[PDB]
């Protein structure tokens, strides 16, 4: 079913570059204000549709830079929220600051502000650059969602619900617009604890009851992805379940049916639900580790590039210096010169220059490691040649450099 | 805890693993194979033990000749190949297998270059790996670590059993820690080849023992006794029950039990640890984020490296001005004549060069008579023109 590269970006380097670029963007002179601890606000909303569907208030999301640690965060703003009870913020925030989960966007702070020209309620989240909602990704008007992708989503939401429910809390909001893809097939709940504050007090439903609602909302989320119609527009659930049954396996239809069902005399628990998707959970555990290996591979390659870069800088500092006289032309530095030629002045038998990057990187790594491998250094007149090991070259190399450190 | 799969010092860890990968021993008695060279022994202790495969087993780090990559070679000493059909068939079945908790096998071949008839299995190479035996048997194992191992072994068994195969070998000496709390089965398909003509038991029967061997592995870690020396399973089960929760004791008992009259399947076992599997799904992903964080910080190192290498290849076959620029950046000298080695200046100048900034610098020849006022934009132009001239020649 699923591919090994399930959690793997196609081009990790560009992806990181684009995300870094998106993280640093600022608007020099915007009408947006500066908060006591936040500045350089940048809107992330593609469309400023004054919509109140999710929280009963219009909501904006800003990328902002914190003043204390200088890191970037996502600020969720509820326009027009008037603080009547400070306890709503303190109690909800006290419960959610504990939560740390790979499938939930962390909340750090909740506060009210007047800097926007009104009474606004601000929620400060982790920032995930170039994130798009499941709504934006799958429902935006122009294809069918692969079943393995849905199972991936199910396992990640299940992961979130395990942590949330175990802490005597509920994921009040499971709408597609409030679940973001922070990377390929990687989803996180983007709006936790907001409904906890908005519905504080006036709510009468208990925790367990709210948790029962999480499963229904969970089931409607899957149904939306399978049918392509948003949850709020699902008029005929039986008709949707039957659409799902024709496109997907019986296993998926059974899971969604268990999530939607409220007529059984048994209370639904995340414990029971996980037991039923154990096989899928193991598969995406595997895929996560394989992607970990992929990231470790690239990370190891770039850390070594860092080491090589510092070696190349030292090399450039040593050779052809200005100024003992002819210091770079005599003794050890002369061999270092021929080594440079061997690595960076490679030429084919025909006489054409060879610019293979691989030969160059391999040689510099062997130099740092001081490998007991021999190479043939050829003089520029080439009448004379020298056989040296990388271990020996490293010795000359370190000795030539620390002479300059002596001179300070 | 959240940092379950996260090394304490990733920097030091990667450096050591890099050194271990490139290391060679100049003159050992070890031979050169048709497609392998620079063999390096990985056996920590050279005690000749034949318990696992009935033959002494050696592991070498070797460099492939076709591709320049490093691999782990498992050598079975004194094994003479009797059936040619056995090797190919076991291979085509395991060549498919790709799993995060199993060391990939690539090739199987016989050799006489070692001074005897040896059977060689070529694996992926995981530098500075240690076995569970070396790690745990050479304090009490936290229960969280054991569930971690169980999920990874369970993961491995799902893929193996689904391919109508069995993990013949689950001993602690053939399960390696390739990183913190990260285990992989190091010896798959070896017993498949050795016992090909002799084994009469079916696939399903072999799979039932895997669960027993799995259960014996866990009991060993909880009690501190090697599987081969577990004389009293009931007493060990009671020890485990006194040190650990009832959940673990239940899992181990299910793995060991063969009296239930019910065929054990990996499907059923996975169902019973569904919650544990979810926790470690989370932990793998949080480590995913951790590695991505460091990678983002390190990603520019490649570009910086190529800029310096580019500079080194153009010079010493417009070139004159580039020479003063190199001098300006890497040959700074104090008023006394002493060399200045500030790293910040070097990085800044190469960064401005790459960016082609319109900022001007004053280049002076060592003879004070000639000077050049140039911008980094102009220097980048020459820098690029000088290079693509060499690409032309190639
Ligand atoms: N933590 C975050 N980091 C980065 N981007 C985020 C984060 N949370 C949300 N976003 C992005 O901000 C944008 C706006 O999100 P929002 O929830 O407002 O969606 P919306 O389409 O405006 O829905 P609504 O109509 O309910 O406001 C989305 O593209 C989303 O991916
Ligand atoms: N695929 C691999 N990549 C890297 N290192 C490995 C690999 N497989 C095994 N090793 C390492 O090689 C060493 C040899 O262990 P091996 O199990 O072959 O013998 P042993 O445990 O020393 O003794 P015995 O042969 O009695 O088991 C171990 O330290 C192990 O971590
Ligand atoms: Mg919005
Ligand atoms: Mg050995």
Residue numbers in the entry:
A (entry chain F): 213 to 354, 363 to 543, 547 to 631
B (entry chain E): 215 to 352, 363 to 541, 555 to 631
Please, what does the article write about this entry?
Two conserved complexes carry out the majority of deadenylation in the cytoplasm: Pan2–Pan3 and Ccr4–Not. As illustrated in Fig1A, Pan3 contains a zinc finger at its N-terminus, a pseudokinase domain (PK), a coiled coil and a highly conserved C-terminal domain (CTD) (Brown et al, 1996; Christie et al, 2013; Wolf & Passmore, 2014). Pan2 contains three functional domains: an N-terminal WD40 domain, an inactive ubiquitin C-terminal hydrolase (UCH) domain and a C-terminal exonuclease (Fig1A) (Boeck et al, 1996; Wolf & Passmore, 2014). In conclusion, through combined biochemical and structural approaches, we have shown that Pan3 is required to couple RNA binding to the Pan2 exonuclease activity.
We obtained crystals of Se-Met-labeled ctPan3 PKC (residues 205–640) with P1 symmetry and four Pan3 homodimers in the asymmetric unit that were solved using single-wavelength anomalous dispersion (SAD) methods. The ctPan3 structure consists of an N-terminal pseudokinase domain (residues 242–497) to which MgATP is bound, a central asymmetric coiled-coil domain (residues 499–538) and a C-terminal domain (residues 555–640) (Fig5C). Although ATP was bound to both pseudokinase domains, ATP was not added to crystallization conditions and is present in all copies in the asymmetric unit of the crystal. The pseudokinase lacks almost all catalytic residues and is predicted to be inactive (Christie et al, 2013). Two distinctive beta-hairpin ‘ears’ protrude from each C-terminal domain. A kink is formed in the coiled-coil region as a result of one of the CTDs (chain B) interacting with the pseudokinase from the other chain, introducing asymmetry into the Pan3 dimer. The pseudokinase and CTD domains of C. thermophilum Pan3 are similar to the recently reported structures for Drosophila (RMSDs of 1.13 Å and 0.87 Å, respectively) and Neurospora (RMSDs of 1.24 Å and 0.93 Å, respectively) proteins (Christie et al, 2013), indicating high structural conservation of Pan3. The principal difference between these structures is that the kink in the coiled coil of ctPan3 is more pronounced, resulting in twists of approximately 28° and 31°, respectively, of the CTD relative to the pseudokinase domain. Second, the highly conserved Pan3 pseudokinase/C-terminal domain also binds RNA but in a manner that is not specific for polyA (Fig4). This region has a theoretical pI of approximately 8.8, and examination of the surface potential reveals a substantial positive charge that could mediate electrostatic interactions with negatively charged RNA backbone phosphates.
